[PDB]
Amino acid sequence: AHRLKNAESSLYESLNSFKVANRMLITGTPLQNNIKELAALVNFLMPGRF
Protein backbone atom coordinates (compact mmCIF):
# COMPACT_ATOMS: atom_id res chain seq x y z
CA ALA A 1 0.00 0.00 0.00
CA HIS A 2 3.01 2.35 -0.08
CA ARG A 3 2.22 2.54 -3.81
CA LEU A 4 -0.98 4.21 -2.54
CA LYS A 5 1.15 6.75 -0.61
CA ASN A 6 0.32 9.56 -3.09
CA ALA A 7 -3.25 10.86 -3.05
CA GLU A 8 -2.86 12.57 -6.45
CA SER A 9 -1.99 9.34 -8.29
CA SER A 10 -4.32 7.68 -10.77
CA LEU A 11 -4.45 4.49 -8.70
CA TYR A 12 -5.62 6.45 -5.65
CA GLU A 13 -8.44 8.07 -7.63
CA SER A 14 -9.35 4.72 -9.22
CA LEU A 15 -9.42 2.72 -5.97
CA ASN A 16 -11.04 5.47 -3.88
CA SER A 17 -14.01 5.60 -6.28
CA PHE A 18 -14.81 1.90 -5.78
CA LYS A 19 -18.00 0.92 -3.95
CA VAL A 20 -16.48 -1.23 -1.19
CA ALA A 21 -17.79 -1.64 2.34
CA ASN A 22 -14.56 -2.60 4.13
CA ARG A 23 -11.04 -1.73 2.98
CA MET A 24 -7.64 -2.95 4.13
CA LEU A 25 -4.06 -1.88 3.43
CA ILE A 26 -1.21 -4.41 3.66
CA THR A 27 2.30 -2.97 3.70
CA GLY A 28 5.58 -2.99 5.59
CA THR A 29 6.41 0.72 5.44
CA PRO A 30 3.34 2.84 6.26
CA LEU A 31 5.42 6.02 6.62
CA GLN A 32 8.34 6.56 4.25
CA ASN A 33 9.09 10.26 3.72
CA ASN A 34 6.64 12.48 5.62
CA ILE A 35 3.34 12.64 7.50
CA LYS A 36 1.42 13.37 4.27
CA GLU A 37 1.84 9.79 3.02
CA LEU A 38 0.38 8.42 6.27
CA ALA A 39 -2.41 10.99 5.95
CA ALA A 40 -3.12 9.68 2.44
CA LEU A 41 -3.23 6.09 3.73
CA VAL A 42 -5.59 6.90 6.61
CA ASN A 43 -7.77 9.00 4.29
CA PHE A 44 -7.97 6.03 1.94
CA LEU A 45 -9.06 3.95 4.94
CA MET A 46 -11.28 6.47 6.76
CA PRO A 47 -12.02 9.57 4.62
CA GLY A 48 -12.74 12.33 7.11
CA ARG A 49 -12.37 11.16 10.71
CA PHE A 50 -8.59 11.78 10.69
Next chain:
DNA sequence: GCCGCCCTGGAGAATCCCGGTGCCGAGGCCGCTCAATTGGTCGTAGACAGCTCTAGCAACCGCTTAAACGCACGTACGCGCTGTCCCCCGCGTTTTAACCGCCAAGGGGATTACTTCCTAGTCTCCAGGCACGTGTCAGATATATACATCC
Protein backbone atom coordinates in the same frame (compact mmCIF):
# COMPACT_ATOMS: atom_id res chain seq x y z
C1' DG B 1 -51.58 -60.36 -10.04
C1' DC B 2 -47.33 -57.44 -10.16
C1' DC B 3 -44.10 -54.33 -12.54
C1' DG B 4 -42.40 -51.21 -16.31
C1' DC B 5 -43.25 -47.50 -20.13
C1' DC B 6 -45.86 -43.47 -22.86
C1' DC B 7 -49.08 -39.22 -22.79
C1' DT B 8 -50.73 -34.77 -20.65
C1' DG B 9 -51.87 -30.96 -16.93
C1' DG B 10 -50.77 -26.98 -13.36
C1' DA B 11 -47.43 -24.54 -10.49
C1' DG B 12 -42.31 -22.29 -9.78
C1' DA B 13 -38.84 -19.23 -11.92
C1' DA B 14 -36.78 -15.88 -15.66
C1' DT B 15 -37.63 -11.43 -18.32
C1' DC B 16 -39.87 -6.81 -19.94
C1' DC B 17 -41.91 -2.57 -18.46
C1' DC B 18 -42.71 1.39 -15.26
C1' DG B 19 -41.92 4.43 -11.30
C1' DG B 20 -38.93 6.60 -7.56
C1' DT B 21 -34.43 8.46 -6.76
C1' DG B 22 -29.32 9.79 -7.23
C1' DC B 23 -25.38 11.70 -10.25
C1' DC B 24 -22.88 14.48 -14.61
C1' DG B 25 -23.03 18.74 -17.85
C1' DA B 26 -24.70 23.10 -18.35
C1' DG B 27 -27.04 27.50 -17.37
C1' DG B 28 -28.96 31.20 -14.12
C1' DC B 29 -27.45 33.94 -10.19
C1' DC B 30 -24.30 36.46 -7.18
C1' DG B 31 -20.03 38.88 -5.96
C1' DC B 32 -15.65 41.19 -7.04
C1' DT B 33 -13.52 44.58 -9.90
C1' DC B 34 -11.16 46.78 -13.40
C1' DA B 35 -11.76 48.73 -17.76
C1' DA B 36 -15.22 50.99 -20.74
C1' DT B 37 -18.30 55.04 -20.47
C1' DT B 38 -19.56 59.97 -19.70
C1' DG B 39 -18.63 64.62 -19.19
C1' DG B 40 -15.74 68.57 -19.70
C1' DT B 41 -11.45 71.16 -21.62
C1' DC B 42 -8.15 72.26 -24.98
C1' DG B 43 -4.64 71.90 -28.62
C1' DT B 44 -3.70 70.80 -33.18
C1' DA B 45 -4.42 67.68 -37.60
C1' DG B 46 -6.34 68.28 -41.26
C1' DA B 47 -9.70 70.47 -44.41
C1' DC B 48 -10.03 74.38 -47.33
C1' DA B 49 -8.56 78.16 -50.20
C1' DG B 50 -5.00 80.37 -53.12
C1' DC B 51 -0.90 80.97 -56.27
C1' DT B 52 3.10 78.90 -59.11
C1' DC B 53 5.28 75.61 -61.95
C1' DT B 54 5.81 71.02 -64.11
C1' DA B 55 4.10 66.50 -65.84
C1' DG B 56 0.54 63.99 -68.27
C1' DC B 57 -2.96 63.28 -72.09
C1' DA B 58 -5.80 63.05 -76.48
C1' DA B 59 -5.18 63.23 -81.10
C1' DC B 60 -2.55 64.29 -84.94
C1' DC B 61 2.08 64.92 -87.85
C1' DG B 62 6.76 63.31 -90.09
C1' DC B 63 11.09 60.33 -90.50
C1' DT B 64 14.04 56.35 -89.70
C1' DT B 65 15.08 51.88 -89.03
C1' DA B 66 15.27 47.94 -86.54
C1' DA B 67 12.14 44.63 -84.89
C1' DA B 68 8.31 41.71 -86.06
C1' DC B 69 6.09 38.64 -89.20
C1' DG B 70 5.37 35.24 -92.82
C1' DC B 71 7.16 31.35 -95.26
C1' DA B 72 9.98 27.42 -96.62
C1' DC B 73 12.93 23.69 -95.20
C1' DG B 74 15.10 20.44 -92.41
C1' DT B 75 16.26 17.85 -88.58
C1' DA B 76 16.38 17.25 -83.72
C1' DC B 77 13.71 15.97 -80.13
C1' DG B 78 9.19 14.54 -77.79
C1' DC B 79 6.83 10.66 -77.51
C1' DG B 80 5.32 5.96 -77.94
C1' DC B 81 6.59 1.00 -77.75
C1' DT B 82 9.29 -2.90 -75.89
C1' DG B 83 12.46 -5.31 -73.00
C1' DT B 84 14.69 -6.12 -68.58
C1' DC B 85 16.00 -6.26 -64.18
C1' DC B 86 15.92 -4.55 -59.77
C1' DC B 87 14.14 -2.67 -56.08
C1' DC B 88 10.24 -1.65 -53.46
C1' DC B 89 6.02 -3.63 -51.55
C1' DG B 90 3.30 -7.01 -49.03
C1' DC B 91 3.41 -10.26 -45.40
C1' DG B 92 4.91 -13.19 -41.54
C1' DT B 93 7.80 -13.25 -37.34
C1' DT B 94 10.49 -11.40 -33.61
C1' DT B 95 12.14 -7.55 -30.86
C1' DT B 96 11.92 -3.26 -28.62
C1' DA B 97 10.94 0.87 -27.06
C1' DA B 98 7.00 4.30 -26.76
C1' DC B 99 3.62 5.11 -23.54
C1' DC B 100 1.64 5.39 -19.21
C1' DG B 101 2.10 5.37 -14.38
C1' DC B 102 5.70 6.15 -10.60
C1' DC B 103 9.31 8.36 -7.22
C1' DA B 104 12.87 12.21 -5.26
C1' DA B 105 14.48 16.81 -4.62
C1' DG B 106 15.47 21.13 -6.55
C1' DG B 107 15.54 25.13 -9.61
C1' DG B 108 13.03 28.32 -13.28
C1' DG B 109 9.63 31.07 -14.08
C1' DA B 110 4.97 33.22 -13.72
C1' DT B 111 2.12 36.18 -10.79
C1' DT B 112 1.45 39.98 -6.71
C1' DA B 113 3.10 43.74 -4.13
C1' DC B 114 6.53 47.16 -3.04
C1' DT B 115 10.62 50.47 -3.34
C1' DT B 116 13.85 53.38 -5.76
C1' DC B 117 16.55 55.84 -9.19
C1' DC B 118 18.29 56.40 -13.72
C1' DT B 119 17.18 57.57 -17.95
C1' DA B 120 14.47 59.20 -21.59
C1' DG B 121 10.76 62.65 -22.79
C1' DT B 122 10.08 67.62 -23.05
C1' DC B 123 11.37 72.46 -23.50
C1' DT B 124 14.47 76.35 -24.86
C1' DC B 125 18.25 78.17 -27.31
C1' DC B 126 21.83 78.00 -30.56
C1' DA B 127 25.04 76.64 -34.16
C1' DG B 128 26.90 73.86 -37.73
C1' DG B 129 25.90 70.22 -41.15
C1' DC B 130 23.49 69.60 -45.34
C1' DA B 131 21.69 71.29 -49.54
C1' DC B 132 22.43 74.36 -53.37
C1' DG B 133 25.06 77.54 -56.40
C1' DT B 134 29.36 79.25 -58.24
C1' DG B 135 34.54 80.86 -59.17
C1' DT B 136 38.68 78.63 -60.10
C1' DC B 137 42.17 75.15 -61.21
C1' DA B 138 44.84 71.04 -62.93
C1' DG B 139 44.50 66.85 -66.03
C1' DA B 140 43.03 65.26 -70.74
C1' DT B 141 42.68 66.25 -75.73
C1' DA B 142 43.37 68.26 -80.25
C1' DT B 143 46.32 70.71 -83.53
C1' DA B 144 50.46 74.29 -85.26
C1' DT B 145 54.90 74.16 -86.63
C1' DA B 146 59.77 72.64 -87.16
C1' DC B 147 63.35 68.66 -88.26
C1' DA B 148 64.96 63.91 -90.53
C1' DT B 149 64.07 61.30 -94.49
C1' DC B 150 62.63 58.33 -99.34
C1' DC B 151 61.94 58.63 -104.09
